[PDB]
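Replying to the earlier thread about multi-chain prediction with a worked example.

Input:
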Amino acid sequence: MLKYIIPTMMLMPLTWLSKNSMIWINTTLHSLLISLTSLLLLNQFGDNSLNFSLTFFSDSLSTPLLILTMWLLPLMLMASQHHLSKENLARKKLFISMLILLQLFLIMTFTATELIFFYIMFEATLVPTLIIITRWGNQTERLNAGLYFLFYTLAGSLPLLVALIYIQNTMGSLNFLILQYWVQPMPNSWSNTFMWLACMMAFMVKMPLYGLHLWLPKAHVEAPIAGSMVLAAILLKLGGYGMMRITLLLNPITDFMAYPFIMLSLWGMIMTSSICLRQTDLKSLIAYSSVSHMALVIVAILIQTPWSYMGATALMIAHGLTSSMLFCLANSNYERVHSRTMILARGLQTLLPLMAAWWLLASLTNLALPPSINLIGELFVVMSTFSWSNITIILMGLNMVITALYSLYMLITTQRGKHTHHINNILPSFTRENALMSLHMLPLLLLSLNPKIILGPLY
Amino acid sequence: AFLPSAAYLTHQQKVLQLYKRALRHLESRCVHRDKYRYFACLLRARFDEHKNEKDMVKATQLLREAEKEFWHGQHPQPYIFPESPGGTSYERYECYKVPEWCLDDWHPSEKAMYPDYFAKREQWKKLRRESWEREVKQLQEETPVGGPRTEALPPARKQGDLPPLWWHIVTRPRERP
Amino acid sequence: SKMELPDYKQWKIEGTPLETVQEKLAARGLRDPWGRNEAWRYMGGFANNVSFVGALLKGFKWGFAAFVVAVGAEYYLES
Amino acid sequence: AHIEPRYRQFPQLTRSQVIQAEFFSATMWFWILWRFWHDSDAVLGHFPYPDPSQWTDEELGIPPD
Amino acid sequence: ITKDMLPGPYPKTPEERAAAAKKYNMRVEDYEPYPDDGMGYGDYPKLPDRSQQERDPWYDWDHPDLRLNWGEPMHWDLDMYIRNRVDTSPTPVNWNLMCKHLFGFVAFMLFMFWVGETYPTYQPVGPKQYPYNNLYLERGGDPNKEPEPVVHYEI
Amino acid sequence: GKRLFIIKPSGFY
Amino acid sequence: SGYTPDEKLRLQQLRELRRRWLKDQELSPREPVLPPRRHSIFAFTHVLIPVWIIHYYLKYHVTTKPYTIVEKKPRIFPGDTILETGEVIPPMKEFPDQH
Amino acid sequence: SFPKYEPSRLASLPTTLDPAEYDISSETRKAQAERLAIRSRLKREYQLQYNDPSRRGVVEDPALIRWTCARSANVYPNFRPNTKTSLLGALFGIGPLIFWYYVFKTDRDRKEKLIQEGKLDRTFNISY
Amino acid sequence: DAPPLTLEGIKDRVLYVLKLYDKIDPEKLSVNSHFMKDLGLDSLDQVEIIMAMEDEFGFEIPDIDAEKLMCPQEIVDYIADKKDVYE
Ligand SMILES: CCCCCCCCCCCCCCCCCC(=O)OC[C@H](COP(=O)([O-])OC[C@H](O)COP(=O)([O-])OC[C@H](COC(=O)CCCCCCCCCCCCCCCCC)OC(=O)CCCCCCCCCCCCCCCCC)OC(=O)CCCCCCCCCCCCCCCCC
Ligand SMILES: CCCCCCCCCCCCCCCCCC(=O)OC[C@H](COP(=O)([O-])OCC[N+](C)(C)C)OC(=O)CCCCCCCCCCCCCCCCC
Ligand SMILES: CCCCCCCCCCCCCCCCCC(=O)OC[C@H](COP(=O)(O)OCCN)OC(=O)CCCCCCCCCCCCCCCCC
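Result:
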């Protein structure tokens, strides 16, 4: 995986030696080249993962998250270069360096063969994200949002550190490839109950679990646009990736440890979706919708059936692209009206028709319109949860009502109705902005042609 | 009740508005024109019966039970004009009513398609920006202390001045753009 | 461009149901001041509209004629 | 020439719309009468409905005891 | 915008109530706050809980789609009482009478469907008669087994 | 004759 | 009563400015100043070329794979002649004539 | 006589059937005139900025910013844990979790008990 | 479809509806004949005149505007402003 680590590190002298007008173009160009190179990871096999070395390996779970991670960096550079135009040159290079460092930490988070190196990268991703939120966020509450984002995560993750070192001392290894073959069943005891909580609660915070999600409608809201893109599209998915790696070791106790948390998501996705019906802040609506979508991934990983893991990894990739595009649309209106209040700028289809078409497409992917991979992941999770217990379709189907009802309300409040009279700085859609919307939406639509690459290791 | 110029409705205004609402709901009940015309003259006679009532408590009481009469005898789906609020074509063309300032955001290759129109728009914008300071100082020299009392605006008192706060009334979009 | 409105003096309510309305209003001491406004609806080409069975039997005469011709055609054509 | 709008009076009719409207009305009544002449049983009844009370006990096998 | 124009805690003294009413651009006699039970409202005015459909539509509003003026203190559930949503407008029939009529009609129709299901209509005929042992091989019967002979006679 | 200008947003971009 | 003299004066002045604005929304005879820019081809490009493409696709890529175009077998009556065999299907038993 | 209109929470009383609508008293005249003055002052303050040629942007509405700040940030600094909020947080926060827990637990216990006794028709169920 | 209104056409139609009203003699009526002062009509008659204007032109005049149109020229100017004639 060193053929992706070294170009990502060479992005640092590429941005610190570029000319002062050239640091966006060069980083965008070569991060798109790294994203083009990322497709070589699709050398996957039906039985064996692509096992590079003692340190790095990539199965069909890590591979779509790697492609999405390496694709998200140029899109974040395009999204973030407008509001940092008057920024100091060295602080601009520090911002780009934090994004590059975050990509570097993520692409060897997903390919970490051994789990304590997974933990070190998984918690190394906090520091650039924390710095981006608390340094280039816009409002006063970015500092409190950074504190919440840091301290839910560490309070979750330090028992994970203790539990992973315990697995190291007991099983002798934390290689995932070794632990595929040396995994011992985990019986019913209180020691194994807190073993399960220590192995799971960090990823429960990072998904986020409902009830532990409180960091997110601050951290996703107070961040700048590149911070919201990487938090929604990649950094929530570290929790689901780590759950799919760690629930190998947690059988068969998971079959009765999952019961509270499944409830916490199956009711919680009803609640947060309902919360999206009454959000006045558009960016907070997208944050609570991210919680609502990741609750299904939490249920699908806890019920641990093949259809559930396939729908969970499809829904993770699909939600990455969809929520990243939704935050970019919300920023494209924030760069004009300078307020995140959704009721302020109305009737924008009269003023920006092509941008309203992008709003329509991202809303339809948010509400899981078939045959998008949003609907593929949504549908496979609903199939597996119906096979889990037949009553859950109620909480699924009711969810799919409310998920429509905030997605089109977001489409109706912002784009439809009479336009606001006193707002007159509504510029036409820049080419950078429409390029950003298309570079989100067009891969999300092309993946419906060949969805088998985003369906995990057990397609 | 709720009016821009007046703080209230007078009793006479309440009687007139009840009369018009009663005739519209009667026309909704009495579809054909001759039959409506007969019952409308009968309702006009009912309003002419208590026209010269001088006891204002008695007139207010009669207006109140006439409102209760109307509320019992209203049509469930009254006739609404198509562009009236509640109509079928009400606020239909609001998606086509693009404001004028968006013409400022046009590219010069699509402004060159209409040379005379934008050359004529420039003198409208110039007239507005030279009238603006005169009409602000007209508003501040005429508004009483404590702010304005009603939402009415004064007219242009001098020759050469334009009325204050005139741009978004004159340059509003058409009803059929 | 310039449209010519017809004369206002040709709209008289005699022979229309507005006359019956005005007579029933004068039977109790009233008078009908909007009769000539509504008078055009009951006059001109909009007077003498058909009944409902006359509405349904629009074209029944020519349809019955074509029916009898076609029945006679197949009654002769079999021979 | 297209239709000129009129005020408080009957509008201008084209010959073509009148003859087409009358032609399709006559077509409807021709079709109704023609199919009523030929089929005559989809409306009034295809087969006779027999009376069960007029049936003999011999053909239904009711031995008298 | 600054600190003293933002919403604050629940007013208890009449001067704090008057400063709150001046902040929310409304009269002191019209300014009622929410009851101080600790639900998180603070000094925010309890506007009289109407939909925005009931606002005068012929009035020139600053926001004509919302029927709402600039500077006017918005209702707490303004996003709820928009005209795309929950209406409170006066109904020609009483609300309780509407509920009683609709519940009576739906319950009576479901009761009469239960009655007609208990007492179904039919025709004075016997069962439809099929050959080959009520079509045993056609209905998916296996050919190695043999059904009992279902025999239909002439009548 | 009597052609009216249609105020529309900028369709150039 | 109706308007005050101030309201009549303001509505007259706004009306004059509005009628000037609406008149000035008209067009010039040169405007819009534009920049300087096979009988049954619809039956060829939209129909016949898709019949060619779809027939090639179904003949050499779809029917070359099993169970992709699965047709219901044709209906066989007493009295038919099979094309692939020549085997005459024997006709039905004689009817107990009812009318 | 006529049936009296009974107003409800979602079907309010008409303007013309309210007995306070016909107040000719001087205190109601003062209240309506003071509301007219507040509304006219806010209207003038809006449309001075709204009709400005030099202004290009958003006429900020402190009523709107005030509403969003009350809906978002003012909720916890004006919260007090008392009887009402504790019973509503236990009733609406952990109540449905307990409810769906016992429902799904009883359903899965019944289903597992049927499966390991060979009773559930699981004949073609091979996708899970 | 939708023929454009002019000031002369609206004036002709408003005076035409007022010449068909049996409480106004059509020889005294002009464009500035005030209904309460010159023509001597009731306020109920003014309401009925505005309702006949609504039935004539097909759009509702609100009461805050209906209670102030006191001569036919005011009615023609109001219909002109609400329909944007002489474009
Ligand atoms: C590998 C090769 C692949 C080739 C095939 C392509 C496969 C899909 C790729 C992506 C397709 C969408 C891209 C165009 C739309 C987005 C931009 C836009 O709106 O432009 C409007 C604009 C035309 O409008 P305009 O008048 O000029 O201005 C717009 C107005 O401002 C305002 O405009 P408006 O609002 O009036 O109109 C917007 C309207 C809005 O229309 C709607 O909202 C209706 C659509 C939803 C309901 C109906 C469809 C439901 C699903 C059924 C269809 C899928 C399955 C069908 C198969 C049979 C059943 C299985 O959009 C459309 O009608 C688009 C038609 C296609 C829709 C596809 C589905 C999107 C819906 C959401 C997701 C649904 C599930 C996923 C489906 C994925 C399928 C692969 O389009 C363009 O100018 C086209 C730009 C270039 C398009 C390139 C497409 C390829 C991109 C990938 C590049 C790399 C690979 C190379 C392929 C190259 C192919 C040539
Ligand atoms: C985000 C906030 C919430 C985070 C929740 C994090 C998980 C919650 C549970 C964590 C428990 C502590 C780590 C357990 C590691 C288990 C490893 C192991 O081998 O266990 C078996 C071992 C068993 O010992 P052993 O394995 O050495 O013995 C051999 C085996 N037997 C027992 C059979 C002889 O367990 C323990 O020794 C103790 C485990 C329980 C520890 C209780 C203390 C902590 C209580 C919970 C704290 C939660 C977070 C607090 C902070 C919140 C925010 C401020
Ligand atoms: C074979 C079995 C058959 C069973 C049949 C009986 C079961 C179903 C019973 C009916 C349930 C649905 C009907 C109730 C909700 C209707 C919502 C709706 O459409 O409201 C419309 C309303 C405004 O519209 P309106 O006022 O009518 O428009 C007038 C013009 N201005 O719009 C709004 O106010 C916007 C509101 C947006 C948010 C809506 C929140 C409520 C969502 C309810 C979801 C219910 C899900 C149920 C799931 C069941 C699962 C089994």
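The first strand of chain A starts at residue 50 and ends at 51.

Feel free to reuse this layout for your own posts.
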